[PDB]
């Protein structure tokens, strides 16, 4: 059927078969220039890589490594979307009736990688599937499955990593060690199209993590790191970033001293520590390590004392023996602080707060949940997802290159020097839309931003708003209802604070809810059509209700 596609679409009367010559014109029609020229150069590298062209000796008379060659082909195919079809035919021509035993194998490797990193256009898809269908029984199903995967999970944003080239010769699946905050590391099977959403799902099913919202996948190399989220990014395309960093640093592409952590980035505005035990355990560890390192850094001593005391209850209980306490404190407190004063004053203060608060003498889970809740309150900014955003038009946010950190407390705009310029509660967020621009409207000021992640950052806020909205038991009245002889109805004025009395704002399927009026104190029936639910989980202050009018 690829014969029929060539007969119909091949522009220069090009051979449907193998050629050992350059190409004077591209196989398909390209109205755009550059695409036209790129098609021919790509072709030159495909051939030089399959051995069908001699590689030069120390335009393209220039040499390159076969790795550099692959990167060239796949690279053009990603950056320029049209060539994606042309290139496939280019590797089909050379793989149809290729009688050199090695050239065939190299071509099919090139389909392994290219079918790893991008899709065909809609028009050409089925034909490619048929040509793969009559493949060698070795790579035949391999490439079909790689194409199904890639077609599902999107276009890779990077050319194949060295690790993938290995996987292609192996025709296998890739093992990857993911470090949990416990220090134990779960090894996961991964292919080219693997996504941090998928990987996090696998970690969940592995350690049984039911409350997964906010667990992200971080990647660390060479005293630098970034996040893959639980979102739709491809970790192979992070590993490629790391490789192209290591080659920049001079080490080998296969040197690869990178690592993947499974870490808690988010805290949801509805976060309940007592909901999941597993989450509480991983994020307990993550917290304590963070205190050891100085990531999570205390502003007041009593808080640190209380954390250490809790930790002792978790590891010790109501037994106070300074042989155990003076043993734990050096390991928990960071070096910088533990050196600041004597272990006698340290064990004495930890045991002091221990005796004071623990008078109940509480499951260890309870104390761990307590310290998780403590963390969530103390460090809203360190538990935020960070984005880079550049302001275009707004007042009160003068900066034009900024860092937006979204977290459970709200949106926070950050100075390049880390001072917070503008805070926003989600109750104050009147809309956030992506166009690569972003339109943020608050209750008072409207802004416009250009950030690359804008879609994502408009999505996350949406996820947080809807979340709150479904849990919101608070509402404001829109129109009035004057009281009647009917005492079933609830009186209210415009802008009243209606509390909706164990109606989660989720239940809007019904058109009636009952509640009480915060001003009146009267309690009665309200039409759900007169309610505007406020996305807060605590009673909204007068300050917030004056703005909402």
């Amino acid at each position: 059927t690829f014969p029929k596609f060539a007969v119909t679409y091949f522009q220069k009367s090009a051979s449907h078969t193998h050629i050992q010559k350059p190409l004077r014109y591209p196989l398909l029609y390209h109205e755009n220039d550059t695409d036209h020229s790129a098609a021919l150069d790509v072709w030159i590298i495909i051939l030089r890589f399959m051995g069908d062209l001699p590689e030069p000796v120390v335009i393209s008379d220039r040499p390159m490594s076969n790795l550099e060659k692959v990167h060239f082909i796949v690279g053009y195919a990603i950056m320029r979307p049209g060539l994606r079809d042309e290139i496939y035919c280019q590797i089909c021509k050379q793989l149809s009736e290729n009688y050199k035993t090695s050239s065939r194998a190299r071509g099919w490797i090139l389909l392994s990688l290219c079918l790893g990193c991008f899709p065909p256009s809609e028009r050409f898809m089925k034909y490619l599937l048929n040509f793969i269908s009559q493949g060698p029984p070795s790579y035949g199903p391999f490439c079909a499955e790689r194409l199904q995967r890639t077609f599902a999970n999107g276009v890779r944003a990077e050319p194949p990593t060295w690790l993938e080239l290995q996987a292609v010769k192996s025709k296998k699946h890739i093992p990857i060690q993911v470090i949990l905050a416990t220090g134990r590391s779960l090894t996961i099977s991964v292919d080219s199209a693997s996504t941090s959403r998928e990987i996090c799902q696998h970690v969940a099913q592995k350690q049984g993590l039911r409350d997964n919202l906010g667990f992200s996948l971080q990647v660390a190399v060479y005293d630098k790191f970034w996040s893959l989220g639980s979102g739709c990014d491809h970790l192979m395309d992070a590993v490629a970033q790391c490789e192209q960093l290591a080659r920049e640093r001079g080490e080998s592409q296969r040197q690869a001293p990178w690592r993947i952590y499974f870490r808690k980035e988010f805290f949801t505005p509805w976060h309940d520590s007592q909901e999941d035990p597993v989450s509480t355990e991983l994020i307990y560890h993550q917290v304590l390590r963070g205190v050891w390192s100085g990531e999570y850094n205390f502003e007041k001593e009593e808080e640190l004392v209380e954390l250490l005391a809790r930790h002792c209850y978790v590891q010790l209980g109501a037994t106070v023996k300074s042989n155990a306490v003076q043993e734990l404190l050096p390991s928990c407190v960071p070096s910088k602080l533990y050196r600041t004063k004597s272990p006698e004053k340290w064990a004495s203060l930890v045991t002091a707060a221990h005796a004071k608060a623990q008078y109940t003498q509480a499951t260890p889970l309870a104390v761990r949940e307590q310290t998780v809740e403590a963390a969530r309150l103390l460090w809203p900014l360190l538990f935020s997802r960070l984005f880079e955003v550049t302001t275009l038009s707004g007042p009160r946010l003068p900066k034009t290159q900024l860092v937006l950190a979204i977290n459970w407390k709200g949106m926070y705009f950050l100075d390049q020097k880390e001072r917070t310029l503008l805070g926003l509660s989600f109750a104050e967020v009147m809309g956030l839309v992506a166009n690569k621009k972003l339109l943020l409207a608050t209750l008072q000021e409207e802004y416009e931003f250009v950030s690359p992640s804008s879609v994502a950052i408009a999505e996350m806020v949406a996820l947080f708003l809807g979340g709150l909205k479904e849990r919101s038991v608070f509402a404001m009245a829109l129109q009035d209802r004057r009281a009647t002889d009917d005492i079933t109805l609830l009186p209210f004025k415009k802008g009243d604070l209606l509390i909706l009395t164990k109606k989660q704002g989720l239940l809007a399927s019904e058109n009636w809810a009952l509640g009480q009026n915060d001003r009146t104190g009267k309690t009665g029936l309200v039409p759900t059509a007169c309610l505007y639910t406020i996305p807060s989980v605590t009673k909204p202050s007068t300050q917030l209700l004056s703005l909402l009018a």
């Binding site: 971080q218 660390a220 060479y222 005293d223 630098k224 790191f225 970034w226 996040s227 952590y261 390590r289 963070g290 390192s293 100085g294 990531e295 900014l381 360190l382 935020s384 960070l386 984005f387 880079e388 860092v403 950190a405 950050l414 880390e418 690359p452």
Partner: peptide, 13 residues
């Protein structure tokens, strides 16, 4: 700071 997480290195955008 926020951008520098001790033990993981520096972020990137």
């Amino acid at each position: 700071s926020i951008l520098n997480r001790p033990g993981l290195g520096s972020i990137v955008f």
